[PDB]
Amino acid sequence: QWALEDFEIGRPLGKGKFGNVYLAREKQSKFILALKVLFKAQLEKAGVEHQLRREVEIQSHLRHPNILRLYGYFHDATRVYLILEYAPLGTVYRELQKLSKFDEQRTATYITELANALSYCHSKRVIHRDIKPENLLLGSAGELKIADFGWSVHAPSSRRTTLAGTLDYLPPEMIEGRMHDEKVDLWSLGVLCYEFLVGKPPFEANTYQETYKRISRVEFTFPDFVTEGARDLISRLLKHNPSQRPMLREVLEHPWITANSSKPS
Ligand SMILES: Nc1ncnc2c1ncn2[C@@H]1O[C@H](COP(=O)(O)OP(=O)(O)O)[C@@H](O)[C@H]1O
Ligand SMILES: O=C1CCC(c2cccs2)=NN1
Ligand SMILES: [Mg+2]
Ligand SMILES: [Mg+2]
């Protein structure tokens, strides 16, 4: 069906390990979208063909306002092209660099939209497993949208591909190669809630080795400015034992969330 010839290409929207994401307009419809480019050689060298199919299969079939749409794909002997919904206000990552910390209203609102989208995913026992600021994008009304489903799967699962980059958002069971389920996304939710309010993730250290120690032993402290209700919700999500982590309904109806968030469940 579609091919490169159908699109005018504009400025780069961002870069990832494999992905190079461009602004684009489809010639006859004038439809604006984002084109994610993957190099076949690189995919093959790394052997993540299976992750790509997972990304395409899972994301194309999900429909939720807080989840980024995937419309289609094509390829061309050197590259694979994913056709994505364009998010015009950029990443949560960028917004955090700009402002340093989010206030309590902004944080709770983001956590609600996340919990809504994740609840929807978990209801088809899809777990995302790569929830972090550079994979959270913003729509034209500033609403959060989960993107990058390259690491997603069905639960329960094992991990067998290598974790290349940062540990900062992964629970103990996942970094230890043990087996995991849905509850991994709830841990990452606690990691995000802290980073939103403080400006850095709770287990951040100077080395891989030290970061790994701090996650497995759940070693973090709060700054004085973090209120009691935020401490309460964050302490609940960062349980070593997955089973002791809350359900998502318990996150959405937590008092701190209800007092501060400006969108509903
Ligand atoms: N639909 C989109 N709209 C705007 N920017 C995007 C979009 N998709 C990706 N980006 C930008 O490109 C970066 C890489 O996209 P992503 O799909 O996460 O690639 P990777 O799989 O390599 O992490 C993102 O962090 C974001 O900055
Ligand atoms: O609902 C849709 C499905 C596909 C789509 C596309 C734009 C350009 C190529 S394909 N835009 N909107
Ligand atoms: Mg990404
Ligand atoms: Mg990816």
Structural description of this entry:
- The chain is α+β, with helices and mostly antiparallel strands and 265 residues long.
- The chain has two domains: 2-90, Phosphorylase Kinase, domain 1; 91-261, Orthogonal Bundle (Transferase(Phosphotransferase), domain 1).
- The chain has helices spanning 40-46, 49-61, 92-99, 104-122, 172-175, 184-198, 208-216, 228-237, 248-252, 255-260, and strands at 7-15, 20-26, 32-39, 70-75, 79-84, 126-127, 136-138, 144-146, 153-154.
- β2 (20-26) and β3 (32-39) form a beta hairpin.
- α4 (104-122) runs antiparallel to α6 (184-198) and α6 (184-198) packs antiparallel against α8 (228-237).
- 32% of the residues are buried.
- The chain binds adenosine-5'-diphosphate, 3-thiophen-2-yl-4,5-dihydro-1~{H}-pyridazin-6-one (A5E) and magnesium ion (MG) (2 copies).
- Residues 16, 134-135, 148 line the site of one magnesium ion.
Task: Annotate the secondary structure layout.
Layout: E1 7-15, E2 20-26, E3 32-39, H1 40-46, H2 49-61, E4 70-75, E5 79-84, H3 92-99, H4 104-122, E6 126-127, E7 136-138, E8 144-146, E9 153-154, H5 172-175, H6 184-198, H7 208-216, H8 228-237, H9 248-252, H10 255-260
Antiparallel strand pairs: 1-2, 2-3, 3-5, 4-5, 6-9, 7-8
The chain binds adenosine-5'-diphosphate, 3-thiophen-2-yl-4,5-dihydro-1~{H}-pyridazin-6-one (A5E) and magnesium ion (MG) (2 copies).
